[PDB]
């Protein structure tokens, strides 16, 4: 099964894989900034743009998953199951939601083409050895 | 925060909350029908309508959840914990995902207006107690069948 | 006084008398649908129709009643008295508010004339003895079937 | 000296008796419906239709019978005669008043064109064995 | 209900109470002339006015009470209950039916205006003491 | 004598022979509906249609047969003769009277052509074995317009 | 009820009762003459006159009665009961069929007006005392 | 001498084999419905259409077989052979005459195209397994009491 | 039922009965001619003329007779009954099939009117005495 | 589901609560005024403005509370809870009912915007100390 | 290489997976129907539709497989090998060939769009629960 | 029942019977070239020519046969069945599918009429004995 939501937006999973793991901000920060900056748009009952529709469903799923995590932590009996599962819910799938939400927020704030250019720039910058590339990573901003 | 995902489409969780279980086909069946019918449309790099994007996001979420469930099943040793968590996932979250997918298919195949009208009619029908409620449930389907 | 809110809409308490008690559904099933179907209209500052104004007044009155019920549950110690009072207010006047909400909601959604037609049809249906009446009791539905 | 009040209308006593007794609902239901629907028309000083007048004298006649029943129940001593009279009044002429009130009210609400076709196809549908007639009884409805 | 059927015809019982009882004719003799004048008209399916319908319905109720009388005479033995019932029927219902029939027959035969004027004149006549009221009671006629 | 009373209107004895027993209403029910429906037409002195005169003659015949049944019931002593005769008269030709009266009534009310169409509808549907006969039979009285359907 | 099949054709049972019994010759001869003269017209699928269709049902009824008579004759054991039943078929109800057959055949073959004239002539002829009446009874002829 | 009588109407003997045997109605009932549906037409001296003449000759040879059967039943001696021959003629030849008669009656009364439609509909219906086929088998009926 | 195939073609069984037996050729001698002359026409799916359809039905019923005969000959055990039945079927109804085939084949080949003329001529010729009939028999030929 | 009904008329509860309590005349005065001045207006089946509908709903709640108080007084036993809940209902929601009733009555009788101006003016004035303000509280009047 | 014959018709093999097996009729019935309906068309030398050619190769390789089955069953000595092979080829390959034949035949008879509509409707029907679906399984007919 | 696909294409097995065995190339030698030349054409949803569909279904049937044979041979332990079945399938019907593939490919690539001429010339060439047959076997090419 090969399904790619970024395909409609012009990007692809492997292209997004150029960016390495675990440098993203915490998903909680992403939610906080989106609320502080996109509170009105999300609450609107009209499809203001394609990105809002996906982000809404992603946020709902993230909330339900966090509720599942807290409920299992509060109700399961043994310590091994509880710590293993609560650590698991924030291990790999959390990275998935984190990267998806980062992509949607960045594209909404700047634009898909700018995000693709930043992706390619980061890929070229990271591919080279550290001994030659500059010590400042590319920064997404206007 | 507080967001109603169905609100963009005009419906609400409370409106669908009238819908009881046993009028939603199983999630696996929704996957089967969606993959069989709308595969070319879904895989397209053009967003033809918000329904497709929402459906795709739900499909990804459900697939990830099933991956989580099988991963837990492979490793957990305590039968009670693993069976309890898998049942929880299949009954609580499964209900929500199944409701959403059914709503998306119904809206896409039958149209927005028809689905909302049928939902209001069903809500009116379900509230009346059995003593005065007609026994023939309203059913809308693509079949010219009586 | 002898004042009937239904009297100026064309309906009447005696006319609504056809529907027997226990027919109307739970109040919460009225509140949830009213909210999730006319939230903006109720919250809007425009009195489009008297139905909305009556529904707003009923909402406030019922909320006040429930606040009083929670108060008496929270403060008083006499258990039998509090149970009797909450039961009385929840069952007796609750029925009146419930039918009020049902009437206005149906009139708004389907039309007052259709509501009156449905009332007379239900009266005809219910008066007939069980031995001859069909099981298909009349029901309004913007949907065909 | 042969008088049938239905004679001025299209119906006839034997034709209206075509339907089986016990199908007409209790008299209290008829009176309550008639009140709730036509209090103003009955109280009006105008004769908008002969049906209203016929119903008016029907109501007065029934009230006289009810007063007779109340008086006989109040004064007389023999329980045998009392129960005999009350049962006879409640059952025998009760049927006639029920039929009369039902006819007038139904004709007014739905018109003669529907009542004189509801007295046919019903009482006819009853005769047919429950194996070739339509599954359910017909109902003057809306 | 609170129905005064006379109010439809313009009069009311309060006004009609001017005529004191014992100045009305016997029911049998009144029915005699009513029939002799409008037999076919009552029996016809044509309804020229509410008077005919009311007369028909009143005749029907009178026949019902006669049926009750013959039933009770045929069944019961004791004389007290029987003759008390007969007295009640001839007293309460008798006066009301007799005045109703007289009013309707008179207004149909001569008109509503003449009969109303007659009631007014009879009232003003009967108010005055006998010492001054003329000894020829007013009579509606040709 | 080769006489076909139905052949005047097109039908035949052996065509209506299709209609199954325990289908027609009892004769008394037919009398109650016919008198209650066409009282004046039957009582009228005008040959408005052959159906009316046919029904009138059948009514007279049935009245005479009932008079005979009452006579045999109230007079004869032998119980065996009594019950044999009454059962015979009630079952054998009373069924024929039921048949004729119902057919005439349906023709007059529903129209003659429709009656023949419904007759052939049974003639086909009833002829099928139960393994292929649907359990939903061709109803004729469209009068009630279904009065709504069941399930 | 009282229904007269001769009512439609202009005659009435009251008038037709003038003719005394033994006047109508016999069922067998009526059937024979009907076969000899008008047999074919019965089978035509067009009703040329109301007499033909009524004659059809009269013949069917008489055949049914003959079958009933012979069948009951073959099965009953008590000779007295069977003999009495056979006596009944030609006594009461056979006379009715003979009367109907005579009326219809005469009306068809000579004509209705001539039939009525013959009835009236026989009525005037019979009443007169035998000592003065002529011995040549009226008979319809061509 | 390889002749298929149904061939010129557009039907075929093997195509007609779709309808299972024992479904076709009794010979006597088809005979007496044909009688009091087409007495005049069969009796007429005009060859209106091949339907009527084919029916004429079919019923003729069927009556000839019936006469032979009764003659042998009356005349021959041993019961076993007589009964065996009667059953043979009534079951085997009776079936073919029955199907011939049914096809002609149905096509004449309702038309050939209607008969073809009914045949193909019944084929698609019967091929369906019982667990999935509905119990509402098709029946041609100019009566629209559907 | 009284059904005669010859009636539609204008002939009758009584007419063909005029031709004596022993002249009509064996059924096989006609089947061979029909095959060898009109195999293509018979096998065609076209209802060219009623003659062809009638011949087809005749051939089918004949073949069913033949199948029955061979079946009984092979299966039945009693030689006497077998011989009796085969002789009966072969001789009695064989004459009828011979008449049918001869009539249809001749009418198709030369024309129905010509065939009828041939039948009448042959009948009158055979009826004629030898002293006066022409010295040669009448034979049908091209 | 928090609602401020005055928002659709234009005002807000906080604007109304800006004014002090115990200023409006007792509830009975308002009820007597409303009755005596608008009996026919409220009893009429015409809804002139939302004022009347709101007033009628207020009267319905007021009657419900009165019947509840009578019930609790007659049925419950302990005086302490009785009087306590009586005082609670009379002070807490009684104030709101009185405020709403007075507002609607005054706005109906004298005007909406003028009543709003009176409210704001008196609210600002009462907070104003006795410095540059007349020693007579503003009084609303025609 | 990946080949999907339905993709030439616009459908897909996976799409056909809705209809659960135990629905596709036995191969023999499909072959009998195809022959009975299109004998001459299949034997024809003209390509009147692609469906005809496709069904032609379907029948051809089906016949080759049947020859394989009969050959291996007749020739081999070991029972397990032969019966296992025949059973497997009858069940697994039989399913695919049967569904291919049914699709071709139905599409040719009714039309491609009608077959697609029937397939999708049946799928939807069987997916849903009972109380939410009509009780009549869809069935295509012309 | 029996179909010759080549008749639809104008040829016959008898015509191709001229081509001897062990003359067609290997199955792979045709399949690989057919793929390399018409992969996009076959994969397209458009049926440009019947040859393409026939080739597609031939490849499907052959691939299913090969898959089944390989799977069963991998399962079964007996060597006789495995080797004999492999040889049989690769020999007889393998040759048949090979010849069909070659025919369709040649007709597609050089043109059907050219194929017919080449086969005719090949037959004429091969008939003659080798003593006079030239050593340059006719070959179809550009």
Numbering used by the authors:
A (entry chain A), D (entry chain I), E (entry chain J), G (entry chain G), I (entry chain E), J (entry chain K), ...: 1 to 142
B (entry chain B), H (entry chain F): 1 to 146
C (entry chain L): 1 to 145
F (entry chain H): 1 to 151
Task: Copy text from the publication.
The HBV core (or capsid) protein (Cp) is 183 residues-long with an all-helix N-terminal assembly domain (residues 1–149) and the C-terminal nucleic acid-binding domain (residues 150–183). Cp forms a stable homodimer, where 90 or 120 Cp dimers assemble to form T = 3 or T = 4 icosahedral capsids, respectively, with the T = 4 complex the predominant (∼95%) assembly product. The icosahedral T = 4 HBV capsid has 5-fold, and quasi-6-fold (icosahedral 2-fold) vertices, where the 5-fold is composed of 5 A subunits and the quasi-6-fold has a B-C-D-B-C-D repeat. DNA-containing and empty HBV capsids are trafficked to the nucleus by a complex of importins α and β (Impα and Impβ) to deposit the viral genome or core protein.
To examine structural changes of the Impβ-capsid heterocomplex, focused reconstruction of the quasi-6-fold regions (also referred to as hexamers) of the capsid was implemented. To perform focused reconstruction, we used the particle coordinates of the I2 density map from the high Impβ sample since these complexes were geometrically defined and biochemically had the best chances of having their quasi-6-fold sites occupied. The capsid particle coordinates were symmetry expanded so that all 30 hexamers were independently included. The six “symmetric” classes were pooled together to produce a 4.0 Å hexamer map. A hexamer model was flexibly fit into the final density map. We found that quaternary structure changed at both interdimer contacts and at intradimer contacts. When dimers were aligned on the basis of the two copies of helix 3 at the dimer interface, part of the four-helix bundle at the intradimer interface, we observe that helix 5 of each monomer has rotated so that the Cα for residue 131 in the loop is displaced by 4.5 to 5.3 Å (5.0 ± 0.4 Å). In contrast, the focused Impβ-bound hexamer reconstruction has a pore diameter of 9.75 Å, expanded more than 1.5σ beyond the simulation mean of 7.60 Å (orange). In the focused hexamer, the CTD density of 1 B monomer allowed the model to be extended by five alanines beyond Thr146, the last residue with a defined side chain. With the C terminus extended to residue 151, the B CTD was long enough to exit the capsid.
